[PDB]
Every structure is written in C-alpha cells, then in structure tokens.
Amino acid sequence: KTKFEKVLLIVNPKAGQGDLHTNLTKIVPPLAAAFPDLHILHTKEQGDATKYCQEFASKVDLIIVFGGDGTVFECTNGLAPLEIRPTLAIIPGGTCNDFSRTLGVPQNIAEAAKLITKEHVKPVDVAKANGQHFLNFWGIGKIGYYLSTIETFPVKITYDGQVYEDEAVLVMVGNGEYLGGIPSFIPNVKCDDGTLDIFVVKSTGIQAFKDYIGKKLFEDSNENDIFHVKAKSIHIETEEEKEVDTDSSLHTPCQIELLQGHFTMIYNPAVV
C-alpha cells in the first residue's frame, strides 16, 4: 500500500538525451507498476506544465515532472502559490537538472523513476523574492553560462536587522545545493535548513571566487573578499535599479523571505 493514491506524470516530449519512446520505456513501467492510478500528460507548449500542475493540484497526491530546469521551474511556480500542494518529484530531463541533483536524484532516468517508487519524501524550503517564488537561486550581476565567462556596483543588504554595505561584482541568494549541473559555489547552502544564503563577491574577490567554483566546500575562505551569511529575512538595495536572475522579471530593490518546508519532495536518502 502506497502513500500516493493518485499520481500525475507530466512529460516534456522534448526532454532527455534520447527519444520519447526510449525515455518512456525507461520511466513509465516502474511508475505504472508501483502506482495503481497514474495519469500521464505530455506538454505541448511553454506554460502547459504550470497549467497541469494547477489543474491537478487538488486532485492528485504526487506530481512527477520529466524534464529540464525550465519545466521543473514551471512546476515550482505552478504549485508554490496554491493552498493545496501535492508532493513533487523530478525525473531529470535536461542538462543541468540542478534541483534534481539537490535531492540526490540519480541522473540515469530509469534509476530516477525507480527512486520515486521508494516514496522517500522530505520537506523543502521555497524562497520568495518580491512575491516571486524560486527554488534555486536569486542573483544580480543562466548560471551555466555566466560561470563560463567568469563592472562593480554598490549594494546595501539588510538581513534580520543587520546590514552590509559595499562594492560588489556579484550578489546571490541561494537555496539549492547545485548550480549549473555542479555543486553550488556557496558553502553549506541547504534547501531545507530554514535559511537563505547571501553570497557577495566584492570588487576585489574575483580571483578567490574563481577558486570556489567546482568545489563543494563547507567552510568559508576569504572573509575579506567575499561576504557570506545566512539569514531568513533579506533586503537588497542598489544605487541604480539592476535586473534580477532566478531559476523571470525582478529588479532591485528587493525583499526576500523563506517559506519553510513549503514543498514536500521525493528524494534519495542513500545520497542525501
């Protein structure tokens, strides 16, 4: 007997290295075997995943998304503002699959589908920036590309009553544990620790920051060239309005809040 009476699987037909038929041979059978009421819908256009989430949110217990970061993000945005939000699961169908990695989901899609079958679920925090939800990151100054080509601007940050003023080349607020297919360069960021990670690279910390990239660090290095703190309530102000990037249209100034345990998600306890 399962804890998910009704299941929806959303499929992006474009997703996955291989072709639709081959992908579906890998993921559907274990799901169909495990869940006696399973509804499968293909997306057709941008926005469909969001609409399916919103339509089935009160009707199913588990929503599974097969697709890349864009499709996953459609789901996050679809579900986050709703009063009733089923458990969510991801089968990685893009190149980065940042949030699936955060949950320790196998990148082999057959293995990812079988994982869902084990029904291991945990609460995950969801961020809100100026009334916009994000799962992974908020940044001023997507990630897979910006890193590859890795000027200064003043910033003022208030976070739980304290403040930080300085000249920064990059400002980020992290929730997810992976960015651009690899471990987040923000040390000890966690999707479920009840706080957000502020990470600032100062005009002078470019070199040091280059060093952080790639590594999974747990302690900080350059308190002088890089500012890193954890906070629950964050306000970021700049000299001139700047544009914001997330997992979208925001811009400074900006208030950020964290919704603790807002989603429940399937994950891999053998890895995370």
Considering only CA atoms, which of 85, 86, 121 is closest in space to residue 103? Answer: 121
CB atoms within 10 A of CB 201: 25
Contact assessment for residue 242 and residue 73, using Cβ atoms and an 8 Å cutoff: no
Residue numbers after which the chain is interrupted (C to N above 2.5 A) read 141, 150, 247
Task: Quote the CA–CA distance of 189 and 221 in Å, as a whole number.
Answer: 15
127-260 under CATH 2.60.200.40, yes or no: yes
- CATH code of the domain occupying 1-126+261-267: 3.40.50.10330
Which H or E element spans position 98?
A: helix 98-102
Residue 45 tokens, joined? 């256009």
Element (H, E) at 21: helix 20-34
Q: Is 73 strand, coil or helix?
A: helix
48-56 and 69-79 are packed helices; what angle lies between their axes, rounded to 10 degrees?
A: 40
User: Can you tell me the distance from the alpha carbon of 113 to that of 36, in angstroms, rounded to the nearest whole number?
Assistant: 15
- Strand pairing of 62-67 and 87-92? parallel
Experimental method: X-ray
What are the start-end ranges of the H helices in 117-199? 143-146
Please state the residue numbers annotated as binding site for Mg(2+): 190, 193, 195, 197
Choose among 89, 72, 66: nearest CA to 4.
89
Show the tokens assigned to 129.
Answer: 């920036």
User: Which SS3 state, helix, strand or coil, does residue 74 take?
Assistant: helix
Annotated binding site: 190, 193, 195, 197
What is the C-alpha separation between 80 and 257, in angstroms, rounded? 13
- Structural contact between residues 109 and 26, judged by C-beta atoms closer than 8 angstroms: yes
Where in the chain are the domains? 1-126+261-267, 127-260
Cα torsion angle, 117, 123, 144, 251, sign: positive
Do 1-126+261-267 and 127-260 show the same overall fold?
no
Q: Record the resolution, in angstroms.
A: 2.1
